Amino acid sequence: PQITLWQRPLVTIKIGGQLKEALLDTGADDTVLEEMSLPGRWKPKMIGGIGGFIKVRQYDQILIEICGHKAIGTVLVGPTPVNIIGRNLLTQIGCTLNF
Amino acid sequence: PQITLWQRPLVTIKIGGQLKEALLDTGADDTVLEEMSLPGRWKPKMIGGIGGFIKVRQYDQILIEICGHKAIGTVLVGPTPVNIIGRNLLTQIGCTLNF
Numbered sequence: 210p211q212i213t214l215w216q217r218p219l220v221t222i223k224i225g226g227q228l229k230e231a232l233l234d235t236g237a238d239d240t241v242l243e244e245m246s247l248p249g250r251w252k253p254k255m256i257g258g259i260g261g262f263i264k265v266r267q268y269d270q271i272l273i274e275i276c277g278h279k280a281i282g283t284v285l286v287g288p289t290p291v292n293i294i295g296r297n298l299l300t301q302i303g304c305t306l307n308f
Numbered sequence: 309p310q311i312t313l314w315q316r317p318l319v320t321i322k323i324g325g326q327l328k329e330a331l332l333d334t335g336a337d338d339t340v341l342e343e344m345s346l347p348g349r350w351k352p353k354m355i356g357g358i359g360g361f362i363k364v365r366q367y368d369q370i371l372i373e374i375c376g377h378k379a380i381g382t383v384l385v386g387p388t389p390v391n392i393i394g395r396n397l398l399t400q401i402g403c404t405l406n407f
């Protein structure tokens with residue numbers, strides 16, 4: 210669909226059988242979700258935001274459904290204020306910015 | 309124009325007679341720019357992101373040009389790692405997310 214920006218672009222996502230709300234963020238290189246349990250081994254990663262850096266857990270090849278669209282990619286988990294969908298997954302569902 | 313997300317969505321902006329590079333961020337409520345001088349009175353404010361909060365100076369009624377389009381709005385100035393155009397200005401140029 211076409212999403213306007215008068216309010217935060219929040220959509221519902223499905224991961225691990227659970228529904229969660231997440232923000233579509235074109236300014237984020239990666240996707241990071243609030244603390245939760247995911248399968249497999251994880252690797253360490255550092256990501257920087259406006260207030261500094263934070264350590265997160267990187268999980269690969271995770272299935273995640275965004276507004277009915279299925280994507281399979283890298284997902285980070287850590288102390289984030291809100292669940293964030295970044296460019297790595299936005300390109301998989303074919304999302305573009307238009308004006 | 310239509311902008312793909314394989315790379316960071318950076319564009320050229322004009323403000324205060326100066327040309328700068330900025331990131332179109334749908335995950336940002338406000339617009340924040342690296343330290344610079346702007347006319348008018350300002351108010352202190354605290355904004356939060358990944359990593360924590362930072363203090364910035366808030367300027368109201370500022371004019372900016374984004375890829376030829378003119379927009380008016382509140383602009384925050386502070387120690388941000390990169391110039392960010394947020395929803396408060398993206399709406400004024402008719403920017404939308406599509407997939």
Ligand SMILES: COC(=O)N[C@H](C(=O)NN(Cc1ccccc1)C[C@@](O)(Cc1ccccc1)C(=O)N[C@H]1c2ccccc2C[C@H]1O)C(C)C
Binds near residue numbers: 232358
């Ligand atoms: C390369 O690193 C990266 O891509 N990091 C990414 C990142 O920090 N992304 N954004 C852009 C960014 C920031 C710093 C450096 C580069 C790029 C910022 C963000 O949208 C995320 C965010 C954070 C908390 C809540 C909601 C959204 C944000 O900070 N939003 C806040 C903001 C920004 C400006 C003015 C006001 C406000 C309030 C709030 O909306 C992470 C991997 C997610």
